[PDB]
RNA sequence: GAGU
DNA sequence: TCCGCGTCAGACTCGTAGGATTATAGCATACGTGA
DNA sequence: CACGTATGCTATAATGTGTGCAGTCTGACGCGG
């Protein structure tokens, strides 16, 4: 085990050996965007793809053209930090090399005329952070991956569209990535139709005529042949035995000299095999059998040269006679069946109004552009530009691939444009499905649902930008001079930059990151959405898509999705799941060869998985042999049953892979109903980090993985010894073996301190190492906000008893001990951001002065000379933060104000009163202030003091960098000089500034001195240019919005303690609101005297079927029992030997504990540091489905000398008497949700009113009135309460006269009703007359 | 049948014959001299030119149909002011009028708050300057960076970029949820709510009641000056119109009424309490 | 109207009116100029298109769109449907003297009572407190009364306590499916920000305290107070109006 | 049926406020219909006594 | 489903029993969010006609 | 996203 | 009289965040109000 | 007169739109051929 794990080991009850460890949890976001910026040379990707797609572009004249060479991302002007503080996007400039080439029109392609090549800027593209976010306008935002219908082909059918007939109409749909949709479909009369972009319906054969197919060729394509020879007098027919199947013999079937079937006799399997084996080719038939057979090709009389019968025409006795007498004695009929080979195309040609190719192109043209006069040029152009033009049609690799596999082709890759083969093949397969061979696909199948991560979407918007610019470019290339015009004079950046900012900004998929919790971040970044552009709508979504699909197994969580209207469409990715190269979801599986289960792993796509039989992970392995039991439980074709051992092809890698990250953290999930578990995994994400990060006693093991992979924890890049610990930073000196030979080899991690989150929670990093500690690479150096020693700590475990109490836990209501409040463990930190804007108005600039009309010296005490509140100052509602006002003009002062200002003397000033003050009822401490000034407005004296701070602090920061880096670098040269001429203390005597002159013999070590000398000077100049940059940014008059001269941002901090109305929950979907905080004296307490922290209501268990919470409580108690026993042995100080014995016996308890942990390897000191942490309670892991069993938990309870029942004797705190029966008591790990009552309580008598309707505004942020809605109105109507209702319609809402008059009556005690007409009705009237409808009031 | 206004109009123009140079000159000679037919034939023949140009000036302010009407008006001015005797072709001349008339109309109607051509053209030269600057400065250009390039006042540049701030629609909803928009949050500021209205009623009734408790002459010299009880707000010298007819005695009695009323507010419990107000 | 940031915001009707006026005046021009008929016709089509757009946008063909892609909201749209005048602003309203907060149990309460947060009640009964403050002569004027309540002075709480006695308040839970979704109680002032609900009426509201919130309304007039105490009081409304059965039952 | 029965009430303010509002107001405008406001809906709309 | 869940919640479900449980659960939950609107529309029509 |  | 196209509906309150974009030459002579 | 706002004129030849999206929702109830 590792060094950070030596400090505290989690006890594992898992029994399945882990073949595959949890991958990096933030894979998707980073790989995708990495592919977008990754410049690929051949196989175009992201930007490269976008340029190669649009470029090279030529002018309308064709003589001038713009070609693309190469692009580069400039390095970001402001880093993530400065972007977040300033409120600007973290981006890189896009510089693109472009070559203007011009052709001569006199020479054929005179390419050597004018070639102008230069590097043009067009837009800054946002960069992805180390943790898969973008900083847009100073706020971390996540672009959630999307789930959409894969381009390709799809066969579907409404099962009984017209409920009257109830006939199944089959259809095909060819879905491209870019271009028009091509639909094929059946009607009731079995006629094949084609529609483009669901336009007006057309006979399917018309499109074939557009591809130049004559009627003869169309029939040759979809139908077989039936040949008729006319010999002597009798009619003869060419036979294929297995045509005459499931049929009635209509005439006497005989051949050479054997009668097989009589008239009106069923031709079964037997007759068919008889005829086939007899080798029958020709049969004599009645002439009357032909009446109704359809002739395939044309026949003309060679003599006259006129049509005897046209193709697709029903034959009669007279046509046949005329055909014979002309000299045609080989009639070709169309083999058409009504049970197997349906005559669809045949009937559709009779419906087809078109004749030749041009007639078909015209009719197509006339569909999409109706009424507009056709031309041949227009018809040909439109049809080629539909599905046959490189420009307007592209299936993409994915589309062509899925298309070819659906049509059973061999070839994966190919053309984005539809070939004639493609269209026909699709029609053919649609017809096969109508015949009964083949099946329709379904859309919910993950083989048809593809995942689109950010990079592909950024690429798409970027293409749009390039297309818009391309319009401008072609238009300016046309009218442009050839010589004067530079390439960059034709390009505009605004359109590209606008398309991309519109994506990362307007888009539904780009949203404010949810960051009130490490788990909330990591789950939000692994989110999949079926919504947004190119997706479904909440309104448009049925129920089929929403529900859990068999293909979701091991790919998507069944138990993670919002209980909103977004219930089916938003979904978290499964743990081990990954994005296929083409974009399909895939899951790891262990290959089983000859019954022996190999450790080779294979990721199977949705489609591949269906073909094999996969064993479940719960199968018992015979210790690297095969399955123990001769029957194994497996699944294939999406359905589950028993199989033999050698039949099994694969097996589930992990027990965990079915569930997502969020769900994987629920212990005993196996014992919780899926509904409750859903709510549990959803609410765990809303857990606010407490002041004290408390580890969970009852974990799963994913805790460590989540905490580390989320990136919120500082982890060690390279192992070594810690040179310097600090609250603000950590310096680690790297070990010689990992430590590179160039640099000094000392890593410095500066820790991010108390900063604001998007939910106004507090982000702080605490150092979790000691000064001078040996550290392994990839260990946790510093804990993030909700993490303890590298494990995830979302809330706090505590002593819980399940029993009713005087109704204070009625419906989920929670009774909590004051002790918890006192210990400040559920206490939380909230950081709010208030800003004060000095704008330029029509009248003049606003000033940020402390000199404000009508202000008490009490108020001005907290503002400095500049008018900004001091750091550290406690403020409450109405206190002024930043002294800012707005200029005002002339104003008729009422005679009373004339009088009043004459009494006081203080006349009104120019600027009015618009100073930023603390919002009402919010109260906090100022922890920081930021000032933005523009370029050339006279700076505040305070802004100057803040610049002095930043400058000297910057100087100190960079000075300490070069000092620690120089000390570490010469410390290496000192060791290099010893290898060769060791004079340790003799070399250190004379000054260190005169050191790098001293050399060594001409060896690799002399070259090491040269490396360290070159880098020492590199750092010397680098320090200069770095400090210049810092100083420039500190001096830099930030570029603000037009009109705004300077902006002051105050950051308030608030300490909020738990109180009644706050929302708390466990991880089993057990919600509750605190009802009461009880005095410790009143809390139920045990015989030992220790009082409970929380009393939860047991009536919230049997109905809910979330028994996870009870098992968690029992095991939590057992964990705390072991903790109390180690705590007792440490208080006594028995000795290392005895502690070691107990702890070994404890770790190696469980029936089949996977993890063995020998204490004989642990040194005595290592043992003591471990026991020290385990005294709070021994941390235990219950993997999801591979968890602790009842027997194991009771055994652990017995090691704790706790009862098997986990129920204990409790005593009422008030009375002292015992409760009538044992109560279940233990430790449930509990979370304080973001729903604080401080944020929810709101109240209003009278306030601002809406603009047109005159009714009060909505929402607590706008100081809003409650909506009394139609449903609420009806209640008063039922009651008969007429005045209450009228009141709410009039004096309370619109009635403007009524409200003021009523107010005055209320202050005069008289509660008189003085109503009139609501102002919204007056508006209604005006709106209806504006429509030109006379609506008048007839009075009495 | 085509009921698209556009396709119908385009059909109509399609079926009028394109002119040669000599036809143009012959028609146009009679057209300047006032031939109803001549002007009509030249216009109707050259409508197709109008549409070709209006198609290049699209996706900007108005729609295609809108552009085409203003373009037609440009072609009309061209036919009115065409010179047949000059060897130069008509198509060349008309191009100018159509582009001109379209551009000028797209400057007055494209903006909800009408910007005069002077402001608009100023702004446009600042904008094209900004484009060149952005193409060598990678990052977008500041107000001072543009001003530095033109050698012109920073306030001039910033005031013009302020006018470029485009309108937002009241009815456009916020938050992807088509629930509440700007109208639904934007409060009536002009008309204040009943707490302030009722405060003013109490204030005005307080001073009226204070005059009844003050000297009759002091209440008939202080109220009628401020226009509290009188009809018109008079000044120190104007109180001579009523009965006072004095300049010194009016000024002493106004302030004597104020001194006794200041002690009435110190005792009731306001004075410095209602100073912050 | 001007936004704070120097921006303007306007109704869609203004864009639609502008369309109509420009095309109509251009038609006056084309008539004064004796224009050829095809052009006259196109302007008359354009005028009809713009009038049609102004009255009822998405009715005749494609609704005319803004730069946002979204179709401009016309006159008909402001009367029509959920967002229209009737459904949104006229049969249901935003209402003064209304509050909301989390609810929690009050098992100590009697059936006619509810725990009402002090800060909430201080603000809901603001004018009643000012009127009582002038009758006691504690407040000289309304501005002084306002500042006294802002400072939350000790005497103000005693006044608030005086006013809320015998004054019924309405509690409402969403959704309001039957009339019992609104009931009146006599309020009991509590320090702390959550409303306390009587257990036995949890059934009518369908209220469970897993974080449920409720809305508070003050009946102002004497008529409204008596409507609340006589018709809507919880003690008065036990039986379901749907079936003759007591809706108030222990659980 | 319920829907048509509600639209059949002589009160056109009630009819229009329910649904189908464009059609209701054209039918009422052409008939020159006068609603004397007897119903509850209608009185709530004008903000009067039930 | 032909194969039922033989286990109980105290015993603990396996991966397949739990996966099979999911379908029913989520169908139920989706019904709450989505169907409440057809029922409510019926309430509305009824109220309007009476 | 919060209670249905 | 039947297919087909059109129009019309689709719970109730609560939260969050603010908003994006384009581009219209250049210069010469008028038109209107205050002084 | 001036400051702001408007109207005007250009002379190689140019002469029929598209363009950017829509994504398919659904069960019901009338209303022309
Ligand atoms: Mg409950
Ligand atoms: Mg609830």
First and final C-alpha spacing in chain E: 46
Q: Who's near A676: CB < 8 A, 6+ residues apart?
A: A1068, A1069, A1070, A1104, A1105, A1106
Residue A162 and residue A467 in contact, taking contact as beta carbons nearer than 8 Å: no
Under 8 Å between Cβ of D41 and A1268 = no
Collapsing DSSP to helix, strand or coil, A1002 comes out as coil
CA atoms of A710 and A131, how far apart (whole Å) = 7
CATH class of A574-654: mainly beta
The answer to whether D30 contacts chain A (CB < 8 Å) is no
Cα distances (angstroms) measured from residue A1030 to each of A74, A1037, A1047, D23: 19, 13, 21, 69
Asked, as a colleague might, if the bond just before C175 is cis with ω within 30 of 0, I would say yes
C-alpha count within 13 angstroms, C-beta hemisphere, residue C154: 0
List, as ranges, residues 1294-1313 from A with C-beta within 8 Å of D.
1294-1295
Looking across all nucleic acid strands, the nucleotide with the smallest C1' to CA distance from residue B49 is H15
Neighbours of chain D (3+ CB pairs under 8 A): A, C, E
**C17 has a chain D CB within 8 A of its CB:** no
Does at least one atom of strand F sit less than 7 Å from the CB of E32? yes
Give the Cα separation of B251 and A442 in Å (integer): 95
Distance A507 CA to G18 C1' (A): 14
Paired sense of beta strands A145-149 and A527-529, if any: parallel
Is the minimum CB–CB distance between D2 and chain E shorter than 8 Å?
Answer: yes
Method: X-ray
Do the chains contact at A1333 and D40, CB–CB below 8 Å?
Answer: no
- Residues from chain B contacting residue C3 (CB–CB below 8 Å): 168
Q: A1035 with A962: CB under 8 angstroms? A: no
> CB distance E16–A1187 less than 8 Å?
no
Task: Count H helices and E strands in chain E, helices first.
Answer: 1, 0
- Report CB contact under 8 Å: B169, C10: yes
> What would the two tokens of residue A199 be?
């336009």
Long-range CB contact pairs, B33-42, < 8 A, 24+: B39/B79, B39/B80, B40/C36, B42/B79, B42/B82, B42/B90
CATH of the domain at D40: 1.10.150.390
Alpha-carbon gap, residue A1016 to A963, rounded angstroms: 11
- The hierarchical CATH code for the domain A151-223+342-442 is 3.90.1110.10
Question: DSSP class of residue A544?
Answer: T
Nearest to A739 by CA among A760, A718, A753: A718
CA of C224 to C1' of F4 (A): 29
| C62 CA – H9 C1', rounded, Å | 39
**Distance between alpha carbon A253 and the CA centroid of its chain, in Å?**
68
Identify the three-state secondary structure at position A182.
strand
Using the mean position of ligand 2's atoms as its centre, give its distance from the Cα of residue C247 in Å: 18
- How far away is chain D from the Cα of A1283, in angstroms, using its nearest Cα? 7
Q: How far apart are CA A1328 and CA A1321, in angstroms?
A: 11
- CATH code of the region A655-711+787-826+1057-1240: 2.40.270.10
Burial of A378 per CB tally in 10 Å (0-12, 13-18, 19+): middle
Return residues 81-100 of C near D (CB < 8 Å).
81, 84, 86-87, 90-91
Structure-token pair, residue A1212: 């009422």
Nearest to B109 among C18, C30, C36 (CB): C18
Q: Closest Cα to residue A768, out of A807, A726, A719?
A: A726
Helix (H) or strand (E) holding A51: helix A47-54
The 8-class DSSP code of residue A1189 comes to -
- CB < 8 Å & 24+ apart, contacts of A91-94: A91/A124, A91/A125, A91/A126, A91/A127, A92/A124, A92/A125, A92/A127, A93/A121, A93/A123, A93/A124, A93/B138, A93/B139, A94/A47, A94/A121, A94/A122, A94/A123, A94/A124, A94/A125, A94/A496
Domains A712-786 and A827-937+1038-1056 share a fold: yes
Q: Does C59 touch chain A (CB under 8 A)?
A: no
- Is the CB of C79 less than 8 angstroms away from the CB of D44? no
- The CA-to-CA distance between both ends of chain B, in Å, stands at 73
Residue with token string 């960059």: A488
Cβ contacts of C63 on chain B, cutoff 8 Å: none
Which among B248, B235, B193 is positioned nearest to A895, based on CA atoms?
Answer: B235
Structure tokens at C47: 């005028």
Chain A window 1040-1099: residues with CB closer than 7 Å to nucleic chain F are 1071
Q: Å from C249 to nearest chain A CA?
A: 14
- C and D: number of Cβ contacts within 8 A: 21
The CA distance from A581 to A642, in Å, is 33
The second-level CATH assignment, the architecture, of A938-1037 is Helix non-globular (6.10)
Binding-site positions of C read 208, 210, 212
Rounded to whole angstroms, the distance from the CA of residue B157 to the C1' of nucleotide H4 is 19
**Spatial distance from the CA of B87 to the C1' of H11 (Å):** 8
Placement of tokens 């390009």 in the chain:
A491
Phi, psi of A931 (to 5 degrees): -125, 130
* Closest residue, CA to C1' of H5: B116
A721 vs A772: CA distance, rounded Å = 6
Question: Rounded CA gap, A865 and A880, in Å?
Answer: 14
Query: A422-433: buried (b, 16+ CB within 10 Å) or exposed (e) per residue?
Result: bbbbbbebbbeb
Q: Cα separation of A319 and A324, whole Å?
A: 9
- 3-state SS, residue A313: strand
Give the separation between CA C129 and CA C189, rounded to whole angstroms.
15
Q: Is the CB of A564 under 7 A from strand F?
A: yes
Q: Which residues of B touch C7 (CB under 8 A)?
A: 165, 167-168
Q: Do D17 and C87 touch (CB under 8 A)?
A: yes
Q: Do chains E and B touch (3 or more CB pairs under 8 A)?
A: no
Alpha helices in chain C (DSSP H): 12-32, 37-55, 57-60, 75-79, 118-124, 126-135, 142-151, 154-164, 202-205, 222-230
- Asked if the Cβ–Cβ distance from A1317 to D34 is below 8 Å, we say no
Resolution of the model in angstroms = 3.9
CA of A164 to C1' of G1 (A): 17
Q: A712-786 has which CATH code?
A: 2.40.50.100
Could you please report the per-residue DSSP string of A235-263?
Answer: EEEE--GGGS-S-EE-S-EE-SS-EEE-T
Torsion over CA: A728, A734, A740, A745 (sign) = positive
Q: Do C79 and D21 touch (CB under 8 A)?
A: yes
Write the CATH number of the domain with boundaries A827-937+1038-1056: 2.40.50.150
Give the closest ligand to the alpha carbon of residue A812.
1
Q: Is the peptide bond before A56 cis (omega within 30 degrees of 0)?
A: yes
Cβ distance A1295 to D40 less than 8 Å, yes or no, reads: no
Contact A655, A19 (CB under 8 A): no
Residue A1335 φ/ψ, nearest 5 degrees: -120, 105
Give the per-residue SS3 of chain B. Answer: CCCCHHHHHHHHHHCCCCCCHHHHHHHHHHHHCCCHHHHHHHHHHCHHHHHHHHCCCCCCCCCHHHHHHHHHHHHHHHHHCCCCCCCCCHHHHHHHHHHHHHHHHCCCCCCCCCCCHHHHHHHHHHHHHHHHHHHHCCCCCCHHHHHHHHCCCHHHHHHHHHHCCCCEECCCECCCCCCCECCCCCECCCCCCHHHHHHHHHHHHHHHHHHHHCCHHHHHHHHHHHCCCCCCCCCCCHHHHCCCCCCHHHHHHHHHHHHHHHHHHHHHCCCCCCCCC
Q: How far apart are CA A89 and CA A138, in angstroms?
A: 6
Contacts of B92 (CB under 8 A, 6+ apart): none
Domain that holds residue D20: 2-50
The answer to whether B and A touch (≥3 CB pairs < 8 Å) is yes
DSSP letters for A714-764: EE-SS-EEEEEE-SSEEEEEEPTTTS-SSS--EEEEEPP-SEE-TTSBEE-
CB within 8 Å of A743: residues ≥ 6 apart = A969, A1015
Sorted by where each begins, the domain ranges of chain A are: 24-150+443-573, 151-223+342-442, 224-341, 574-654, 655-711+787-826+1057-1240, 712-786, 827-937+1038-1056, 938-1037, 1255-1340
User: Burial, D4: exposed, middle or buried (Cβ in 10 Å; 0-12, 13-18, 19+)?
Assistant: exposed
Nucleotides on chain G within 7 angstroms of protein Cβ = 5, 7-27
Q: How far apart are CA B187 and CA B192, in angstroms?
A: 10
Q: What are phi and psi of A991, to 5 degrees?
A: -65, 150
Domains: count for chain D: 1
**Please, which residues bridge with residue A153 across strands?**
A174
């Amino acid at each position: 085990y590792s060094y950070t794990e030596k400090k505290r080991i989690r006890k594992d009850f898992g029994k399945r050996p882990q073949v595959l460890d949890v991958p990096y949890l933030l894979s998707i976001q980073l790989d995708s965007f990495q592919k977008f910026i990754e410049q690929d040379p051949e196989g175009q990707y992201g930007l490269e793809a976008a340029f190669r797609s649009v470029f090279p572009i030529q002018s309308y004249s064709g003589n001038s053209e713009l070609q693309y060479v190469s692009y580069r991302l400039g390095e970001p002007v402001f880093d993530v930090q400065e972007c977040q503080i300033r409120g600007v996007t973290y981006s890189a400039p896009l510089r693109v090399k472009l070559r203007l080439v011009i052709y001569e029109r006199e020479a054929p392609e005179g390419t050597v005329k004018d070639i102008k090549e230069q590097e043009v800027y067009m837009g800054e593209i946002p960069l992805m952070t180390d943790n898969g976010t973008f900083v847009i306008n100073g706020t971390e935002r996540v672009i959630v991956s999307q789930l959409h219908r894969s381009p390709g082909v799809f066969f579907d059918s409404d099962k009984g569209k017209t409920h009257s007939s109830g006939k199944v109409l089959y259809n095909a749909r060819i879905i491209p990535y870019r271009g028009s949709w091509l639909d094929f479909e059946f009607d009731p009369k079995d006629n094949l139709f084609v529609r483009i972009d669901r336009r007006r319906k057309l006979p399917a054969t018309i499109i074939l005529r557009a591809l130049n197919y004559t009627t003869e060729q169309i029939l040759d394509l979809f139908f077989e042949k039936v040949i008729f020879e006319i010999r002597d007098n009798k009619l003869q027919m060419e036979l294929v035995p297995e045509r005459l199947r499931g049929e009635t013999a209509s005439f006497d079937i005989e051949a050479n000299g054997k009668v097989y079937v009589e008239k009106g006799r069923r031709i079964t399997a037997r007759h068919i095999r008889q005829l086939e084996k007899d080798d029958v080719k020709l049969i004599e038939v009645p002439v009357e059998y032909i009446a109704g057979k359809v002739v395939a090709k044309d026949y003309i009389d060679e003599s006259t040269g006129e049509l005897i019968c046209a193709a697709n025409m029903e034959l009669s006795l007279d046509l046949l006679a005329k055909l014979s007498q002309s000299g045609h004695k080989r009639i070709e009929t169309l083999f058409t069946n009504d049970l197997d080979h349906g005559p669809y195309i045949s009937e559709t040609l009779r419906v087809d109004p078109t004749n030749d190719r041009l007639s078909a192109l015209v009719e197509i043209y006339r569909m999409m552009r109706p009424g507009e006069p056709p031309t041949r040029e227009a018809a040909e152009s439109l049809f080629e530009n539909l599905f046959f033009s490189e420009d307007r049609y592209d299936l993409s690799a994915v589309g062509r691939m899925k298309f070819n596999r659906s049509l059973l082709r061999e070839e994966i890759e190919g053309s984005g444009i539809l070939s004639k083969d493609d269209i026909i093949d699709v029609m053919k397969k649609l017809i096969d499905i109508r015949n009964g061979k083949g099946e329709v696909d379904d859309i919910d199948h993950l083989g048809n649902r593809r995942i689109r991560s950010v990079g592909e979407m950024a690429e798409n918007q970027f293409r749009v930008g390039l297309v818009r610019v391309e319009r401008a470019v072609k238009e300016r290339l046309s009218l442009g001079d050839l010589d004067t015009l530079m390439p960059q004079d034709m390009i505009n950046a605004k359109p590209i930059s606008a398309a991309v900012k519109e994506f990362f900004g307007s888009s539904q998929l780009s949203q404010f990151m949810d960051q009130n919790n490490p788990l909330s971040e990591i789950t939000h970044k692994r989110r999949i959405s079926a919504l947004g552009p190119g997706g479904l709508t909440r309104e448009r979504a049925g129920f089929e898509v929403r529900d859990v699909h068999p293909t979701h197994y091991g790919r998507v969580c069944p138990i993670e999705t919002p209980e909103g209207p977004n219930i089916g469409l938003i979904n978290s990715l499964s743990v081990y799941a990954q994005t296929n190269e083409y974009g399909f979801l895939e899951t790891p599986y262990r290959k089983v060869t000859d019954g022996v289960v190999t450790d080779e792993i294979h990721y199977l796509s949705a489609i591949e998985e269906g073909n094999y039989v996969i064993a479940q992970a719960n199968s018992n392995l015979d210790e690297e042999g095969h399955f123990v039991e001769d029957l194994v439980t497996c699944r294939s074709k999406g359905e589950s049953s028993l199989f033999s051992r050698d039949q099994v092809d694969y097996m589930d890698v992990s027990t965990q892979q079915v569930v997502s990250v969020g769900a994987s953290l629920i212990p005993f999930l196996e014992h919780d109903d899926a509904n409750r578990a859903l709510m549990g995994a959803n609410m765990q994400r809303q857990a606010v980090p407490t002041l004290r990060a408390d580890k969970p006693l009852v974990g799963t093991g994913m805790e460590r993985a989540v905490a580390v992979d989320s990136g919120v924890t500082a982890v060690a890049k390279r192992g070594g010894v810690v040179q310097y610990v600090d609250a603000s930073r950590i310096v680690i000196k790297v070990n010689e073996d990992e430590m590179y030979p160039g640099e000094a080899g000392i890593d410095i991690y500066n820790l991010t301190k108390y900063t604001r989150s998007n939910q106004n929670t507090c982000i702080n990093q605490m150092p979790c190492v000691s000064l001078g500690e040996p550290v392994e690479r990839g260990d946790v150096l510093a804990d993030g906000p909700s993490t303890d020693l590298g494990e995830l700590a979302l809330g706090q475990n505590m002593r819980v008893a399940f029993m009713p109490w005087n109704g204070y836990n009625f419906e989920d209501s929670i009774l909590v001990s004051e002790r918890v409040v006192q210990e400040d463990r559920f206490t939380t930190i909230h950081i709010q951001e208030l800003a004060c804007v000095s704008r330029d108005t029509k009248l003049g600039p606003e000033e940020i002065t402390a000199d404000i009309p009508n202000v008490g010296e009490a108020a001005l005490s907290k503002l400095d000379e500049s008018g900004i509140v001091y750091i550290g100052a406690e403020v409450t509602g109405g206190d002024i933060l930043v002294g800012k006002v707005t200029p005002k003009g002339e104003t008729q002062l009422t005679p009373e104000e004339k009088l009043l200002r004459a009494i006081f003397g203080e006349k009104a000033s120019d600027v009015k009163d618009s100073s930023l003050r603390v919002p009402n009822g919010v109260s906090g401490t100022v922890i920081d202030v930021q000032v933005f000034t523009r370029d050339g407005v006279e700076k505040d004296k305070r802004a100057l003091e803040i610049e002095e701070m930043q400058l000297k602090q910057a100087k100190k920061d960079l000075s300490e960098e070069l000092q620690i880096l120089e000390a570490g670098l010469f410390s290496r040269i000192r060791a290099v000089l010893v290898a060769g001429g060791v004079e340790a203390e003799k070399l250190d005597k004379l000054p260190r500034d005169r050191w790098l002159e001293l050399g060594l013999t001409d060896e690799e070590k002399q070259n090491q001195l040269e490396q360290l000398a070159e880098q020492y000077d590199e750092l010397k100049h680098e320090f200069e240019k770095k400090l210049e940059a810092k100083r420039r940014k500190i001096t830099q008059g930030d570029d603000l919005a037009p009109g705004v001269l300077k902006i002051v941002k105050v950051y308030l901090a608030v300490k909020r303690r738990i109180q009644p109305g706050d929302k708390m929950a466990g991880r089993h979907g057990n919600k509750g609101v605190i009802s009461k905080i009880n005095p410790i004296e009143d809390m139920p307490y045990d015989e030992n005297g220790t009082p409970v922290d929380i009393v939860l209501n047991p009536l919230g268990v049997p109905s809910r079927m979330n028994i996870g919470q009870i098992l968690e409580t029992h095991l939590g108690m057992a964990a705390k029992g072991i903790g109390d026993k180690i705590n007792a042995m440490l208080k006594q100080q028995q000795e290392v030997a005895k502690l070691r014995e107990f702890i070994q016996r404890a770790y190696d308890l469980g029936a089949d504990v996977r993890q063995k942990v020998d204490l004989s390897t642990f040194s005595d000191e290592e043992v003591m540091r471990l026991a020290e942490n385990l005294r709070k309670g021994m941390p235990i892991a219950t993997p999801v489905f591979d968890g602790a069993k009842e027997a194991e938990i009771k055994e652990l309870l017995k090691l704790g000398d706790l009862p098997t029942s986990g129920q204990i004797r409790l005593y009422d705190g008030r009375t002292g008497e015992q409760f009538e029966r044992p109560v279940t008591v233990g430790y449930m790990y509990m979370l304080k949700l973001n729903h604080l009552v401080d944020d929810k309580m709101h109240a209003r008598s009278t306030g601002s009113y809406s603009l047109v309707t005159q009714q009060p505004l909505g929402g607590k942020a706008q100081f809003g009135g409650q909506r009394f809605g139609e449903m609420e109105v009806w209640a008063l109507e039922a009651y008969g309460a007429a005045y209450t209702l009228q009141e709410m319609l009039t004096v309370k809402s619109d009635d403007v006269n009524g409200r003021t008059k009523m107010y005055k009556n209320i202050v005069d005690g008289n509660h008189q009703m003085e109503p009139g007409m609501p102002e919204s009705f007056n508006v209604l009237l005006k709106e209806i007359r504006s429509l030109g409808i006379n609506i008048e009031l007839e009075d009495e | 049948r085509v009921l698209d206004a556009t396709q119908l109009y385009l059909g109509e123009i399609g079926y009028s014959p394109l002119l040669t140079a000599e036809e143009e000159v012959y028609f146009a000679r009679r057209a300047l001299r006032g031939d109803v037919a001549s002007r009509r034939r030249m216009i109707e023949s050259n409508l197709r030119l109008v549409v070709k140009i209006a198609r290049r000036y699209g996706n900007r302010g108005l729609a295609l149909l809108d552009l085409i009407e203003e373009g037609n008006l440009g072609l009309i001015r061209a036919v009115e002011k065409f010179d047949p005797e000059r060897g130069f072709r008509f198509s060349t001349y008309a191009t100018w009028w159509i582009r001109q008339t379209i551009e000028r109309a797209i400057m007055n109607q494209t903006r909800t708050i009408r910007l005069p051509i002077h402001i608009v053209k100023e702004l446009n030269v600042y904008l094209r300057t900004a484009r060149e600057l952005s193409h060598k400065l990678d990052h977008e250009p500041s107000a001072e960076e543009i001003a530095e390039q033109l050698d012109k006042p920073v306030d001039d540049v910033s005031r013009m970029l302020r006018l470029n701030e485009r309108i937002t629609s009241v009815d456009t909803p916020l938050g992807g949820d088509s629930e509440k928009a700007l109208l639904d949050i934007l409060a009536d500021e002009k008309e204040n709510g009943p707490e302030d209205t009722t405060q003013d009623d109490d204030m005005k009734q307080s001073i009226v009641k204070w005059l009844f408790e003050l000297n009759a002459k002091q209440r008939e010299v202080l109220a009628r000056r401020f226009g509290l009880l009188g009809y018109e707000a008079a000044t120190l010298e104007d109180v001579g119109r009523e009965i006072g007819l004095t300049r010194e005695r009016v000024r002493q009695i106004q302030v004597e009424g104020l001194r006794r009323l200041r002690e009435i507010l110190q005792t009731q419990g306001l004075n410095i309490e209602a100073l912050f107000l | 109207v001007p936004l704070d940031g120097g921006r303007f915001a306007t109704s869609d009707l203004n864009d639609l009116y502008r369309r109509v006026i420009n095309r109509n005046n251009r038609l006056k021009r084309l008539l004064d100029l004796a224009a050829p008929d095809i052009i006259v016709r196109n302007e008359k089509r354009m005028l009809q298109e713009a009038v049609d757009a102004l009255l009822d946008n998405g009715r005749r063909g494609r609704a005319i769109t803004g730069s946002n892609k979204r179709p401009l909201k016309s006159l008909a749209d402001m009367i029509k449907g959920k967002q229209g005048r009737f459904r949104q602003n006229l049969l249901g309203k935003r209402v003064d003297y209304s509050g909301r907060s989390v609810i929690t149990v009050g098992p100590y309460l009697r059936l006619h009572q509810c725990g009402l947060p002090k800060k909430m009640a201080l603000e809901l009964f603001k004018p009643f407190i000012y009127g009582k403050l002038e009758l006691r002569g504690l407040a000289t004027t309304i501005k002084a009364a306002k500042k006294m309540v802002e400072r939350e002075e000790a005497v103000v709480w005693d006044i608030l306590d005086e006013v809320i006695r015998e004054h019924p308040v309405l509690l409402n839970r969403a959704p309001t499916l039957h009339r019992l979704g609104i009931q009146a109680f006599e309020p009991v002032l509590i320090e702390g920000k959550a409303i306390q609900l009587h257990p036995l009426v949890c059934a009518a509201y369908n209220a469970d305290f897993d974080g449920d919130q409720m809305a508070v309304h003050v009946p102002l007039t004497l008529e409204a107070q008596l409507e609340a105490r006589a018709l809507m009081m919880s003690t008065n409304n036990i039986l379901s109006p749907a079936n003759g059965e007591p809706i108030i039952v222990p659980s | 049926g319920i829907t048509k029965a509600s639209l059949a009430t002589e009160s056109f303010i009630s009819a229009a406020s329910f649904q189908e509002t464009t059609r209701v107001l054209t039918e009422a405008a052409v008939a020159g219909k006068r609603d004397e406001l007897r119903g509850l809906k209608e009185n709530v709309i004008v903000g009067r006594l039930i | 489903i032909e194969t039922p869940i033989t286990a109980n919640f105290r015993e603990g479900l396996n991966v397949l029993q739990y996966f099979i449980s999911t379908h029913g659960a989520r169908k139920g939950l989706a019904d709450t969010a989505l169907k409440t609107a057809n029922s409510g529309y019926l309430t509305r029509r009824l109220v309007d006609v009476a």
